[PDB]
Design a protein around this ligand. Sequence first.
Ligand SMILES: CC(=O)O[C@@H](C)c1cccc2c(-c3ccc(CS(N)(=O)=O)c(F)c3)c(C(=O)O)[nH]c12
Ligand SMILES: [Zn+2]
Ligand SMILES: [Zn+2]
Length: 233
Amino acid sequence: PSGEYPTVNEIPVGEVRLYQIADGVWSHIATQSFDGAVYPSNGLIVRDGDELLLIDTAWGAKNTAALLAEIEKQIGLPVTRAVSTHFHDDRVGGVDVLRAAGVATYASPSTRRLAEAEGNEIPTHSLEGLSSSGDAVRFGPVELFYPGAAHSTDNLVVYVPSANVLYGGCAVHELSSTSAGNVADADLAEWPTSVERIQKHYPEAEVVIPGHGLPGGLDLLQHTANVVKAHKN
Ligand SMILES: CC(=O)O[C@@H](C)c1cccc2c(-c3ccc(CS(N)(=O)=O)c(F)c3)c(C(=O)O)[nH]c12
Ligand SMILES: [Zn+2]
Ligand SMILES: [Zn+2]
């Protein structure tokens, strides 16, 4: 009831929340168990005329089915395309559910290769034009940007120009974060440089959404660089 952004202990595993970020922009929030602990994660929904563009799954098949049901209840427009912003399960787990619901699924070739090698679900379509740091391409109502290696080598960020919303995905941490999250596939040395590229490219961002946790403003970018430095040590 508070209308505040929902946190890990407020979402049972299997349920999905939506949160209105701006006109035609929502985040989606779900929770999942991994290695015996429970974590929240975010994705994005962007209105695309009378259709919706989805950014990232809800971290699992059941969660992603629940996401589609929540979208139908709260928005009532069809999801026609999805982009996964890197290869981990919190981004691609649920792609098979999307594909069986008629959603066209996309990711960079780097993400597709990494997902395949890991045994994770694989988006159908490859997004070219994103292989060099600083690259950007348009995809419906968003811009996709490859900042360089950070949380993962393939991580993409997403900008919604109509609303100045920057979806950082897992390359960006929330302000309360005290660690750099799951760093198994990260490049802690390159991460600050990749964040600097995001800061330079999107200086008018008004809302910044992390891959996990609460949205805020541009301060999330500098905070992320700071915590990555601290974790590395
Ligand atoms: C290899 C890989 O990453 O697998 C993915 C599916 C994965 C599994 C489990 C946890 C994470 C985290 C993670 C971990 C801790 C925190 C702080 S806390 N207070 O506990 O919530 C957080 F915000 C995010 C992340 C991420 O850093 O993006 N990714 C995760
Ligand atoms: Zn990840
Ligand atoms: Zn993540």
